[PDB]
Design a protein around this motif. Structure first.
Motif, PDB file in Angstrom:
ATOM      1  N   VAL A  17       0.837  -1.197   0.000  1.00 56.01           N
ATOM      2  CA  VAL A  17       0.000   0.000   0.000  1.00 56.01           C
ATOM      3  C   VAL A  17       0.873   1.248   0.000  1.00 56.01           C
ATOM      4  N   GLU A  18       1.898   1.263   0.852  1.00 52.69           N
ATOM      5  CA  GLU A  18       2.808   2.401   0.892  1.00 52.69           C
ATOM      6  C   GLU A  18       3.556   2.557  -0.424  1.00 52.69           C
ATOM      7  N   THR A  19       4.001   1.447  -1.016  1.00 53.57           N
ATOM      8  CA  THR A  19       4.719   1.541  -2.283  1.00 53.57           C
ATOM      9  C   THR A  19       3.837   2.133  -3.375  1.00 53.57           C
ATOM     10  N   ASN A  21       1.143   4.028  -2.987  1.00 50.99           N
ATOM     11  CA  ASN A  21       0.874   5.424  -2.668  1.00 50.99           C
ATOM     12  C   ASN A  21       2.054   6.304  -3.051  1.00 50.99           C
ATOM     13  N   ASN A  22       3.270   5.870  -2.721  1.00 50.34           N
ATOM     14  CA  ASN A  22       4.445   6.690  -2.997  1.00 50.34           C
ATOM     15  C   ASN A  22       4.702   6.812  -4.493  1.00 50.34           C
ATOM     16  N   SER A  23       4.611   5.706  -5.235  1.00 47.10           N
ATOM     17  CA  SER A  23       4.830   5.785  -6.676  1.00 47.10           C
ATOM     18  C   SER A  23       3.805   6.696  -7.341  1.00 47.10           C
ATOM     19  N   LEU A  24       2.526   6.531  -7.001  1.00 50.20           N
ATOM     20  CA  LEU A  24       1.499   7.353  -7.625  1.00 50.20           C
ATOM     21  C   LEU A  24       1.621   8.813  -7.210  1.00 50.20           C
ATOM     22  N   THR A  25       1.984   9.080  -5.954  1.00 50.63           N
ATOM     23  CA  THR A  25       2.196  10.458  -5.530  1.00 50.63           C
ATOM     24  C   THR A  25       3.366  11.087  -6.271  1.00 50.63           C
ATOM     25  N   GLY A  26       4.439  10.326  -6.487  1.00 50.58           N
ATOM     26  CA  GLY A  26       5.558  10.854  -7.248  1.00 50.58           C
ATOM     27  C   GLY A  26       5.180  11.183  -8.678  1.00 50.58           C
TER      28      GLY A  26
END
Lengths: 26, 120, 120, 120, 26
Positions: A17-19, A21-26
């Motif tokens: 989930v964190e991965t 979220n971080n990829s899409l936020t980037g």
């Protein structure tokens, strides 16, 4: 009992989930 | 005319994830010169397109952060984030560990509180 | 105006997601003309606005994708994606299955390793 | 004298988040004047950046929603949505609970089915 | 047994997935 694998799967989902979220936020 | 075909489809059971792999690794470079400090933290196996804000957290081991060493840059496409930054050695004093965090945007900000870190 | 009102909020007991339901289904339809093969595959119940790369994988289930048979499309907003393509029947002479995968980008690599598959 | 130290970084173990805690809470101010109703739902502790459609669900819980009352808005960077709407009183006659939902699009849509609801 | 904490973690991840989805959709 055998829910150790379930705990591992929960940890994998927690990291995934964190991965995502971080990829899409980037 | 040509031979046709019309198979019905079937869901697969183990739809395993593909693509790159999340394993935070890295090697830092605390080169120091006359009175400034350039630091090249090269990280690999990170998150495909994420922001990786890394600075110097003082002894406190959640402690305060000399924010005047923020390096913000993005993680390429396979998790190849390469952070760099100059900071006068005087400001650095009492820093104990270079913490790498995730970012919420290229304007600093804190999302994760410590994905990878090393003493000094 | 003449009448007011003030109500504090309560977050219910359970909140349920709506919209599309991820129920992958499909409908493959080959039509092999003179040394050429057209393949119109209709996938309903998919992921609302996702990429769906589809290939013909050889035997060896498991085995290598005939990469020259890639078909790519988006799934609208309810999860309806239609994949069309055209490949000489000589290259896909050893295809054993048509594996549908998810995509990372427009014309690119896979994000999954096969969501739905039909045997040929 | 370029004092240089090379340190391999450890993959950490504590990766707790840092930002808005999703803890839905707020109030409502429905104010009647001369046959019109102005509703102001100020919410805090919500999703940091999310569309939050809110309308009046009638009694029946399920019940239909007088969609001529859809109040749409997006949140800030801390999670503060301010829904505002003008609805004829005769329309909102026989309404039971103002249900706030999540918005799949700025055009509306009920991603979630009630993240917070107040009895009216 | 002690998997009550596991259920709590599952609930937290269930809410976190929705929070990430909603923020990114917004």
């Amino acid at each position: 009992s055998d829910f150790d694998a379930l705990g591992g799967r929960v940890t994998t989902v927690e990291t995934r989930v964190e991965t995502v979220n971080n990829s899409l936020t980037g | 005319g040509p031979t046709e075909g019309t198979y019905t489809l079937a869901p697969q059971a183990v739809v395993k994830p593909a693509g790159p792999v999340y394993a935070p690794a890295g090697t830092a470079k605390i080169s120091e010169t006359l009175g400034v400090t350039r630091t090249t933290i090269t990280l690999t196996g990170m998150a495909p397109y994420a922001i990786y804000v890394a600075h110097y957290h003082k002894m406190g081991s959640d402690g305060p952060a000399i924010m005047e060493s923020r390096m913000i840059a993005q993680a390429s496409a396979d998790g190849k984030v390469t952070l760099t930054g100059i900071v006068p050695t005087a400001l650095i004093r009492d820093a104990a560990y270079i913490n790498v965090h995730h970012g919420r945007d290229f304007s600093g900000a804190l999302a994760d509180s410590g994905v990878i870190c090393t003493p000094i």
